[PDB]
């Protein structure tokens, strides 16, 4: 039982605790939960109920019933049971809003004094309200400026009254949000969390909590399979062995597992942390081990597709390319076996984007520029890696595949360009980079820089969520794909690192929760 052994990982998927009479008993909860959500409740209570599930990692099982449910309680004109409660009315406002129903920021106008635009002080002890109204005003859009002052008055109130709280859970519940709000959080590993604060819960729905316990491990018997195969082929590729990139395949698959968690989605997931592992591993090739030479040709071979100059690379240069070209051949097979779709011109190009991205940084670096924050961003929004990922993910999950849809989606609409941006400056948040460059570019301190960039991931997510309510030309998993992503990226980027990542790896993906 270690995360980083990969005798122990390439081992994991032989046996599993997960039988035929778990796998009964789950569709026997499932259909319960589902006439638990479909049936009848007061509709605060349902919301409470819907959000439960959510938060349990469930929406994936229940997705029709849940918007079906807030569907029927949006239509209401019955409106007693929430108005005049802020709780009611924040809890309602989010989890319309997730599933594609809109409501007005102004139902928040009523607690805020009319003068000020401040919310009334009278709030400043409601815990579930304040909480509720946090995690909603994350759902905004640009321009709403209530939800704006609903964020930095619920963050100031919740900071104040978390050292107040009685119920421990709740105190808990409070310390989490105040570390990342829900919307921002991923969803496997929000799921592992919740499942044991769900538990404790005074409203706690023991036939829910059964079925999420057992869905948790039933899924968790997918990942320790996938891992697997990924083990065997990253000991196959030899770069286990490379001086660089400590644990990149571990890392990568569980960046993936933030992206898409659902086994129906286990073959995708596969080639998405394949191609992660390829990306750590060459970024370090780029950033600690190349000379420019080997580089330049590096990037040349992969601009051209064509391996003829690969021996003139070194060995452990040489390796990551090849293990690079396979697996790009690999994957634009799979979409041609398996979607009808050639799909190798897209993978080629996204690498080839992705390495020139790298080339760039290292001529910057090689030459002393320091380059303005926008500068930055354009090239780093790609080298992060992700239009590489997401470009692959629509590849192979897009129905009716083309040239002019992959065109479309590696060209990076705004939608997909917020998601890049978003997980690059997160993870320079989470330490050259954003804030280094905005202080050159500025003369701003590290603090007030730092304060910047966090004002570019609220404001980000605001076109993200605004793109969700729009009309889009993508759709499901890649929709999801978009957003969770930079839930992954939130979630691994917080500021021991790795007591904490090996704690979640072991909790999520090695041990399964004990059934009574
Ligand atoms: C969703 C998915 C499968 C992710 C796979 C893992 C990937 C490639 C994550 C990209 C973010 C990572 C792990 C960055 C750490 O690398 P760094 O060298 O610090 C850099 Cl931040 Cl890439 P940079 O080289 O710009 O300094
Ligand atoms: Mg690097
Ligand atoms: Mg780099």
Same mark, same amino acid.
């Given at each position: ?112 004094? /009319? ?63 105040? =570390? ?29 909590? /059964?079925?999420?316990?057992? =869905? ?245 997510? /605001? ?54």
């Amino acid at each position: 039982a270690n995360l980083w052994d990969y005798d122990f990982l390439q081992s994991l998927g032989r046996h599993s605790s997960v039988t035929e009479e778990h796998v009964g008993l789950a569709e026997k909860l499932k259909g319960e939960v589902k006439s638990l959500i479909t049936g009848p409740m007061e509709p605060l209570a349902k919301l409470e109920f819907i959000d439960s599930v959510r938060r349990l990692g469930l929406k994936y099982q229940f997705e029709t019933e849940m918007k079906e449910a807030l569907a029927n309680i949006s239509k209401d004109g019955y409106d007693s049971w929430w108005v005049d409660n802020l709780r009611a009315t924040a809890l309602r406002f989010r989890l319309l809003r997730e599933n594609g129903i809109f409501v007005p920021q102004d139902v928040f106008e009523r607690f805020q004094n /009319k003068e000020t635009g401040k919310f009334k002080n009278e709030l400043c002890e409601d815990v579930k309200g304040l909480l509720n109204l946090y995690e909603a005003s994350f759902l905004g859009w640009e321009g709403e400026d209530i939800l704006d002052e609903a964020r930095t008055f619920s963050t100031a109130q919740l900071k104040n009254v978390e050292g107040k709280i009685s119920s421990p859970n709740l105190a808990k519940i409070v310390h989490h949000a105040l =570390d990342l709000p829900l919307h921002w959080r991923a969803i496997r590993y929000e799921a592992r969390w919740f499942i044991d604060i769900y538990e404790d819960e005074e409203d706690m729905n023991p036939t829910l909590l /059964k079925y999420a316990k057992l =869905d948790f491990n039933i899924v968790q018997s997918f990942h320790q399979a996938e891992i697997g195969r990924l083990a065997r082929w990253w000991v196959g590729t030899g770069l286990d062995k490379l001086p660089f990139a400590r644990n990149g395949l571990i890392q990568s698959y569980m960046y993936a597992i933030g992206m898409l968690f659902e086994p129906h989605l286990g073959e995708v997931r596969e080639m998405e942390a394949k191609v992660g592992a390829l990306i750590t591993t060459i970024d370090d090739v780029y950033d600690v081990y190349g000379t420019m030479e080997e580089l330049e040709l590096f990037t040349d071979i992969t601009e051209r597709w064509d391996i003829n100059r690969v021996d003139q690379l070194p060995r452990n240069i040489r390796m990551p390319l090849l293990t690079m070209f396979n697996t790009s051949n690999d994957i634009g097979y799979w979409a041609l076996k398996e979607r009808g779709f050639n799909g190798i011109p897209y993978t080629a190009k996204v690498w080839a984007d992705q390495l020139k991205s790298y080339t760039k940084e290292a001529k910057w670096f090689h030459e002393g520029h320091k380059p303005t924050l926008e500068e930055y961003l354009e090239n780093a929004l790609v080298s992060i890696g992700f239009p590489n990922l997401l470009v692959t993910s629509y590849l192979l999950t897009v129905d009716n595949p083309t040239k002019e849809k992959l065109d479309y989606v590696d060209s990076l609409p705004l939608f997909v360009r917020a998601s890049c941006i978003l997980c690059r400056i997160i993870n320079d948040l989470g330490t050259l980079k954003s804030i280094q460059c905005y202080m050159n570019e500025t003369g701003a301190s590290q603090e007030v820089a730092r304060e910047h960039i966090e004002g570019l991931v609220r404001m980000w997510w /605001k076109r993200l969520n605004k793109c969700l309510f729009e009309p889009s030309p993508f759709t499901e998993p890649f929709l999801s794909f978009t957003i969770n992503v930079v839930r992954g990226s939130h979630f691994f980027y917080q500021y021991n690192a790795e007591s904490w990542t090996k704690n979640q790896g072991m909790s999520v993906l090695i041990h399964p929760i004990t059934l009574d």
